[PDB]
Nucleic acid binder design. Structure first.
Lengths: 164, 138, 117, 122, 191, 35
RNA sequence: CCAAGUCUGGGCUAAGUGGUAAAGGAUGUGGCGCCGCGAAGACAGCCAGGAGGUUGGCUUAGAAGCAGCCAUCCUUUAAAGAGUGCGUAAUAGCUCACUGGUCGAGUGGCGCCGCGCCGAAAAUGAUGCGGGGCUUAAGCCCAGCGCCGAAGCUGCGGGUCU
RNA sequence: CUCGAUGUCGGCUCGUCGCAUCCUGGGGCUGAAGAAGGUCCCAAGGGUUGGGCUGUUCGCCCAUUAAAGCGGCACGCGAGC
RNA sequence: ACCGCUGAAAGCAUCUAAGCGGGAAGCCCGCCCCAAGAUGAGGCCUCCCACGGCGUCAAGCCGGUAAGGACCCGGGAAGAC
C-alpha cells in the first residue's frame, strides 16, 4: 500500500518489475507466486493468499516495492565510520584504498551499481541504487576491516558504542 | 506388582524414615496443589527429599501439605550370587496409584508458593501434574 | 543420432514418478521410449533434502565401488530401471529406453546438476 | 647418525670424557645427530668431578662424525672420531676450550663460540 | 601432439656454483601428427603419410604453436623449455618384476630370535575372524618394473644443440637411459 | 551453548527460530543461548 | 517392480515425520473457552516528566529499587510503581509496571485440544522392502464406493472309509 | 548354535573401520587485551615418536613432540610366527 | 559451525521460508594411476578390395590380398610360463 512518485516507469512482466527513473535505473524481480499490483498512479499489495502466511509474503513485497521506488528515484546511502587511531582512508583509483596496519592496505571496487565515497578520509560511506545491494556490500567492508571493539577502533556501523 | 515378605516377618512395622507431612500455611478457599498420573513405587528417599527441597526454597505459608508416604520395599544382591536368592531389603515407598491427590499448595493469594511447589514438581521424578483445586488457585 | 519415432515423448514439471512408471509400463510390453527434457522434469518440493537423497546416490561410493550417475540423464536411469527387474527383458528393457538433455529429436534439473548435472 | 646409545668423546673441557646419545633434538620422528645437530644424551664418564661428573643429564651438539658429511660443494669430509660439545640451553658451550678441529657447519647452524675456540675448523 | 618428449640420456652432475646433478635427454622434433580438436564433430587423429621410411614397417598453446611446426612439414625442434624451467616427465618404471611384500611394499619382517630361523620375508596377516574374508586393501606382491611412472616440479636448467638435447635438474627419469621420456611444467607450484 | 535446555536471560534475550532451531538471542555475550 | 481404484468425499502435513525412544523446551501450525477494550478511540512505534516525605532496618567501611536479611506505608498534586531491570565505591543516567497529539478497527492473555521441530552420537557402506513420493504425490485421521487374493467356500468330475 | 571339538593371555606383523577429536583447521564463549590458557558447537584429513622395569596390557619412570587420542572387529588376527 | 545484508507474517525487531552473500587441513574439480570385458564394446588416421563352386533370407564349405599378422630363429632392467 504505497506510491510511485515522479518518473517511476513501471513494467511488471512474467514476474519481473522494471523500474526506470532518475539516478535509479533498476530492473528487479518480483514473484509470480502471488498477485501484482499497479495502476499507473499508485500500486500496492495483491492477496494471492490473504492468509497469514503469504499474507506477510507480500507484507514484505510492499517494502520490496517501496524499494524499487525510493531506490529508482533517490538512490540509497550507507553511513560508515572510520574509527582508527592509525587506520585511515581516502579514495584512490576507481575504488577505495583503506588502510589499518598489516602492511598491504587494499583496493576495493564498487562494481557497476555500487559506488563509494570519501567525504573525508576518516569517515566514508556508499551510495548505490538498491538499499539491498547496498547495506550488504556497504557492510561487507565495514567488517572486511576488523571493528574489534576491545577498546574502540575500526570500521563500524554508524551509531555504535564502546566496551571494556 | 511384587511386594513384601510380610508386615512383621520380613520387614513390616517401620517409620520408613522421612520428613513428615505439613508445611506452608492454612486459607479457607484458595485451592493450590499438585498431583500426578504416573504409577511408581514412589522412590522413598528421592521422595522424602524432593518435597523437602520444596520447603528449602519457600519457607512458610503455601498448605505445603503433602499426601504421600511409602511403606513397603524391594531387595536383591546378598549371599551366593544370582540363583536361590534369599533377600536383603532397602528402599521403601508407596504406589502412586496412576495419579491422585499429591501435596497441596493451599492458601489465599500466595502464588509466591505456587511457583514454589512448582519448583517442587520440577524435582520429584515421574513427570507430575501442575494443577488447582475446587475453585482453582484464586 | 536421429532414430525412429516409436516412443515419441519428453518431460518437464510433471511428477518424476508414475512418470517413468509408465515410461516402462510401455518400457515393458515391448516398446522404445526416446524422449528428453531432464532439467525441466519435476519431483518433490523440499528441494534441499530434495538434492540430498540423490546425493545419497551422489557419494554413495563403495570400495567395491558405487558410482552413482551425475546428470539428469541418470536420475531417470536409476528410478525407471528401478521399476524393472534384472533378467534379460528387463535389462534390454533398459537399453530400450533412452532420454537426453535439451533436445535432439522433435523441479527436474537441480538435484542432478546439483550432484553433477 | 648417533642416537640411542652411541657414544662420543669431548673436545672441549666442560669436565667430560664421553656421552651417551638419548634423543636427536629437533622434533618428533627424527632419527639423527649429525654435527651441527644437537643431542639429548648424558655422561658415560667424566674426569674426576671437574664440574660435570659421570652420569649427568646433558645437552650437546654435533662436530665430529665418521659418518662422512657431503659438503654442498659436492665435496666430502669425515673424521677418525665421533663426539661433540655440551651446551647451555642457549646453544652455548661450557668447555672454555676446544680440541680436535671441526667443520664450517657449526657456523651455519650457530655456535661460533666454538667455531673459533677450535684449534682448526675443516 | 600436446606436449613434448623423448628418451633418457643419462645422469651425471658437475659444476654450477655449489654443484648439482642432473640428467641428459635426447630429442629433436619427432614430427607432428595431426592435432587435438573435437570440432563440427569428432576430430582427433589423421595421417597424411609423410613419415620416416621404415615406419610402414608397422604401417591451446602447447598443441597450438604445434600447428606451427606440424604444418611446417612435420617435425618441431624441442627446447621452448629454456634456461631454468619446470616441465614434467613420465618415464617407464623398470622391469623389476614380481617381488616379496618386502621392497615391493615397505614392511618389517621376521624379527630377532626369528629374524632368521631359516625364517624371513613374508607379510604378517590378512583379515580378522568376524570382519569378512578379505579386503581389496592390503596390496600384494604387486609386480613392479613396468609402471608408467613420472613426477612433478621437474626443473630444467639448460640446453644446447648438436643434436637437440636437454640438461636436467635432478634425474630420476624413472626408466633407464635409452628410455622413453616425456616432459611438460604442469600445474607448477614454484611457477 | 547449553544445546539442551535454554530459557531467557537478560529481561530481553529473545526467542528466535533458525532451521526450526531455537537459539537464544539478546544484547549480551552472556546469553549466546543455543541448542 | 507384482495381481488389483495415479477411486471419489472432507479434514491435517511443509519435518521426509512417516522409515524405532524418554525427562525436557519453544507468540510452529490448525480447531475450541476466558480477562481488557478502539470514539474513559485499545497492545507494539514516537513526544515528555522520566514526581515528592521515599536517600527506612542487619551490615554500613556501602542499601539509599540497580550488594544481600526485614519493610511495603504516607502524600501536595497530571499518579501513585512493595521503584522486576545495565551498573559502580555506596550515591550519580536510561527502562516500563504511567499516559497527550499523530493514527485508527481488531489487539495482548491462560485453560482444551488434533498434527509437528531440538534433545537423539558409532565403528565394512549406504537405506522407506526397493525405485520412490510433498492439497488422487504421499502420509496420517473420519466418510461411501468397486476390483484383487488361500489349496478356504461354490461348479465340474472321479477317489475313499464310517 | 560348537564337546564327530570355534586352538584361549601379552607380543609380532598387516591393518580397517568410529567419534563422544590427542595434534591438526574452522568457529561462538571467557572472569579473553597481548601471549598463552579455559568453555562448548563443526570437522576425521593426515598424523599420534625411543627407552626403562615388568610374561604382561595397565602402569610408574626416563628424553622428545604439535600431539604423544577413546574404542570397534571373536577385547582383529596360530591353518602367519 | 560459524557471521551478515535485504525484509514479511508480530503497523515496532528477526540471517529468514522465499532473495543475495561471508566462511573451513575438510566434499567436488584440480595434481599422479589405471581404465570401455562401462556386453552403451567408444574416437580417429593409415593401410587392404569383391575370389571360387555348390538349392537360398546357401551371414555354409575353397584360393587368395605380407594390409596384415604369425609361427621359428636372435636378441632385451620384458620378463616364473
Amino acid at each position: 500500500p504505497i506510491e510511485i512518485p515522479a518518473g517511476v516507469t513501471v513494467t511488471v512482466n512474467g514476474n519481473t518489475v522494471t523500474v526506470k527513473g532518475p539516478k535509479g535505473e533498476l530492473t528487479r524481480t518480483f514473484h509470480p507466486d502471488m498477485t501484482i499490483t499497479v495502476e499507473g498512479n499508485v500500486i500496492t499489495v495483491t492477496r494471492p493468499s490473504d492468509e497469514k502466511h503469504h499474507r506477510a509474503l507480500h507484507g514484505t513485497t510492499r517494502s520490496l516495492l517501496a524499494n524499487m521506488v525510493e531506490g529508482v528515484s533517490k538512490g540509497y546511502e550507507k553511513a560508515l565510520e572510520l574509527v582508527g587511531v592509525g587506520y585511515r582512508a581516502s579514495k584512490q583509483g576507481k575504488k577505495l584504498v583503506l588502510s589499518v596496519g598489516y602492511s598491504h592496505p587494499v583496493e576495493i571496487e564498487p562494481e557497476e551499481g555500487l559506488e563509494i565515497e570519501v567525504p573525508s578520509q576518516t569517515k566514508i560511506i556508499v551510495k548505490g541504487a538498491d538499499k539491498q545491494r547496498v547495506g550488504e556490500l556497504a557492510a561487507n567492508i565495514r567488517a572486511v576491516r576488523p571493528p574489534e571493539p576491545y577498546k574502540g577502533k575500526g570500521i563500524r556501523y554508524e551509531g555504535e558504542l564502546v566496551r571494556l | 506388582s511384587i511386594k513384601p515378605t510380610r508386615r512383621e516377618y520380613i520387614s513390616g512395622i517401620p517409620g520408613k524414615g522421612i520428613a513428615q507431612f505439613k508445611m506452608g500455611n492454612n486459607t479457607y478457599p484458595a485451592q493450590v496443589e499438585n498431583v500426578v498420573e504416573k504409577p511408581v513405587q514412589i522412590r522413598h528417599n528421592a521422595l522424602e527429599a524432593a518435597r523437602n527441597a520444596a520447603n528449602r526454597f519457600v519457607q512458610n505459608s503455601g498448605k505445603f501439605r503433602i499426601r504421600k508416604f511409602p511403606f513397603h520395599v524391594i531387595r536383591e544382591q546378598d549371599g551366593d550370587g544370582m540363583r536361590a536368592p534369599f533377600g536383603k531389603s532397602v528402599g521403601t515407598a508407596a504406589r502412586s496409584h496412576g495419579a491422585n491427590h499429591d501435596f497441596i499448595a493451599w492458601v489465599n493469594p500466595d502464588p509466591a508458593v505456587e511457583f514454589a511447589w512448582r519448583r517442587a514438581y520440577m524435582k520429584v521424578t515421574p513427570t507430575v501434574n501442575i494443577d488447582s483445586s475446587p475453585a482453582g488457585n484464586a | 543420432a536421429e532414430f525412429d519415432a516409436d516412443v515419441i515423448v519428453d518431460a518437464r514439471d510433471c511428477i518424476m514418478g508414475r512418470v517413468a512408471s509408465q515410461v516402462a509400463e510401455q518400457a515393458l510390453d515391448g516398446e522404445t521410449v526416446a524422449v528428453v527434457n531432464a532439467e525441466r522434469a519435476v519431483i518433490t518440493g523440499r528441494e534441499e533434502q530434495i538434492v540430498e537423497k540423490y546425493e545419497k546416490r551422489v557419494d554413495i561410493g563403495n570400495d567395491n565401488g558405487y558410482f552413482y550417475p551425475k546428470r539428469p540423464d541418470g536420475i531417470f536411469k536409476r528410478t525407471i530401471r528401478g521399476m524393472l527387474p534384472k533378467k534379460q527383458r528387463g535389462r534390454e528393457a533398459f537399453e530400450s529406453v533412452r532420454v537426453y538433455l535439451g533436445n535432439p529429436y522433435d523441479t527436474l534439473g537441480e538435484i542432478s546438476e546439483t550432484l553433477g548435472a | 647418525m648417533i642416537q640411542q646409545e652411541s657414544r662420543l668423546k669431548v673436545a672441549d673441557n666442560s669436565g667430560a670424557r664421553e656421552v651417551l646419545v638419548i634423543k636427536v633434538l629437533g622434533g618428533s620422528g627424527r632419527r639423527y645427530a649429525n654435527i651441527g645437530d644437537v643431542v639429548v644424551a648424558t655422561v658415560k664418564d667424566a674426569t674426576p668431578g671437574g664440574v660435570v661428573k659421570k652420569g649427568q643429564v646433558v645437552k650437546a651438539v654435533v662436530v665430529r662424525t665418521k659418518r662422512g658429511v657431503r659438503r654442498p660443494d659436492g665435496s666430502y669430509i669425515r673424521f677418525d672420531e665421533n663426539a661433540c660439545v655440551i651446551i647451555r640451553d642457549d646453544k652455548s658451550p661450557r668447555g672454555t676450550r676446544i680440541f680436535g678441529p671441526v667443520a664450517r657447519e657449526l657456523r651455519d647452524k650457530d655456535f661460533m663460540k666454538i667455531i673459533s675456540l677450535a684449534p682448526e675448523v675443516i | 601432439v600436446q606436449g613434448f618428449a623423448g628418451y633418457k640420456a643419462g645422469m651425471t652432475p658437475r659444476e654450477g656454483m655449489e654443484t648439482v646433478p642432473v640428467t641428459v635427454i635426447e630429442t629433436p622434433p619427432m614430427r607432428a601428427v595431426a592435432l587435438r580438436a573435437y570440432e563440427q564433430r569428432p576430430l582427433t587423429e589423421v595421417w597424411t603419410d609423410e613419415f620416416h621410411s621404415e615406419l610402414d614397417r608397422t604401417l591451446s598453446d602447447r598443441l597450438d604453436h604445434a600447428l606451427d611446426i606440424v604444418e611446417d612439414g612435420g617435425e618441431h625442434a624441442m627446447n621452448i623449455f629454456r634456461a631454468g624451467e619446470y616441465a614434467d616427465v613420465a618415464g617407464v618404471t623398470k622391469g623389476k618384476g614380481t617381488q616379496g611384500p618386502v621392497k615391493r611394499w615397505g614392511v618389517q619382517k621376521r624379527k630377532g630370535k626369528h629374524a632368521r630361523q631359516g625364517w624371513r620375508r613374508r607379510i604378517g596377516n590378512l583379515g580378522p575372524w568376524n570382519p569378512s574374508r578379505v579386503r581389496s586393501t592390503v596390496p600384494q606382491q604387486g609386480q613392479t618394473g613396468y609402471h608408467q611412472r613420472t613426477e612433478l616440479n621437474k626443473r630444467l636448467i639448460d640446453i644446447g644443440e648438436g643434436g637437440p638435447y636437454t640438461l636436467v635438474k635432478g634425474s630420476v627419469p624413472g626408466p633407464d637411459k635409452r628410455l622413453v621420456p616425456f616432459f611438460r611444467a604442469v600445474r607448477p607450484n614454484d611457477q | 551453548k547449553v544445546r539442551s535446555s535454554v530459557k531467557k536471560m537478560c529481561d530481553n534475550c529473545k526467542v528466535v527460530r533458525r532451521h526450526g532451531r531455537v537459539l537464544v538471542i539478546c544484547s549480551n555475550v552472556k546469553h549466546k543461548q543455543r541448542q
